[PDB]
């Protein structure tokens, strides 16, 4: 859930 | 076609050029599609990748990739949901989690980051051990 959204935005930022 | 391609917030020229950068034989891998989504400022999860794989497999035509990108918009995203997830772990109610506490959360559950990804992300945000997780969630969402 929320966790996945957090990880998703971190992956986006680090690209 | 039935997908929300019109709505896809993103420059469509970039959508196309990013596809041409990564495509082979007219198709783009899911890994490269998610990369492109990220370059466009979208945030796919494993749920999004699983959905598109279930429909079309590991390599997407241009149209299928457009459909994948529309799956990645996540209009419901907000900072409150992110903060509340971290707040679950802040049982002494300080407003802070340490880098180690954050690394553990991010690497143990969900779409787990590697130790190095988590550590690099946390180090990019702050030089201090204590992380204001509200500010962190605000930062990553933008
Ligand atoms: N690999 C994760 C697929 S669903 C499992 C999961 C963990 C955390 C969440 C949501 O926060 O969902």
Domains B1-77 and B78-142 share a fold: yes
Q: How many residues does chain A have?
A: 15
> What is the per-residue burial (b if ≥16 Cβ within 10 Å, else e) of B91-129?
eeeeebbebebbbebbbeebbebeeebbbebbeebeeee
State which CATH number among 3.20.20.70, 3.40.50.300, 3.40.50.720, 1.10.238.10 fits the domain covering B78-142: 1.10.238.10
CATH architecture, domain B1-77: Orthogonal Bundle (1.10)
Compute the nearest-CA separation of B38 from chain A (Å). Answer: 5
Provide the residue ranges of all domains of chain B, joining segments of one domain with +: 1-77, 78-142
Angle made by CA atoms B124, B129, B132, in degrees to the nearest 5 = 75
CB B1 within 8 A of CB B63: yes
Q: What is the dihedral of CA B82, B84, B90, B95, to 10 degrees?
A: 80
Cβ(B63)–Cβ(B2) below 8 Å: no
Ligand 1 atom 7 nearest Cα: B110
Inter-chain contact A6–B86, Cβ cutoff 8 Å? yes
Distance (Å, whole) CA B51 – CA B1: 16
Is the Cα torsion angle B76, B80, A9, B86 positive or negative in sign?
negative
Q: Under DSSP, is residue B98 helix (H, G, I), strand (E, B) or coil?
A: strand
Quick one: residue B139, left, alpha or beta (phi over 0 = left, psi -120 to 50 = alpha)?
alpha
Task: Please report which residue ranges of B27-114 form alpha helices under DSSP H.
Answer: 30-39, 46-56, 62-71, 79-87, 99-108
Burial A1-15 (b: 16+ CB within 10 A, else e): ebbbbbbbbbbbbee
Technique behind the model: X-ray
Number of H helices, E strands in chain A: 1, 0
């Amino acid at each position: 859930g929320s966790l996945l959204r957090v990880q998703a935005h971190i992956r986006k930022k680090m690209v | 076609s039935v997908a929300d391609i019109q709505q896809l917030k993103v420059d469509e020229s970039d959508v196309r050029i990013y596809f041409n950068e990564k495509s082979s034989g007219g198709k783009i891998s899911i890994d490269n599609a998610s990369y492109n989504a990220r370059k466009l400022g979208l945030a796919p999860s494993s749920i999004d990748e699983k959905k598109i794989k279930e429909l079309y497999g590991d390599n997407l035509t241009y149209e299928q990739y457009l459909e994948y990108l529309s799956i990645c918009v996540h209009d419901k995203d907000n900072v409150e949901e992110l903060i509340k997830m971290f707040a679950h772990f802040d049982n002494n109610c300080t407003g802070y989690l340490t880098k180690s506490q954050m690394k553990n959360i991010l690497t143990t559950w969900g779409d787990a980051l590697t130790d190095q990804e988590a550590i690099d992300a946390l180090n990019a945000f702050s030089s201090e051990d204590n992380i204001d997780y509200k500010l962190f969630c605000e930062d990553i969402l933008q």
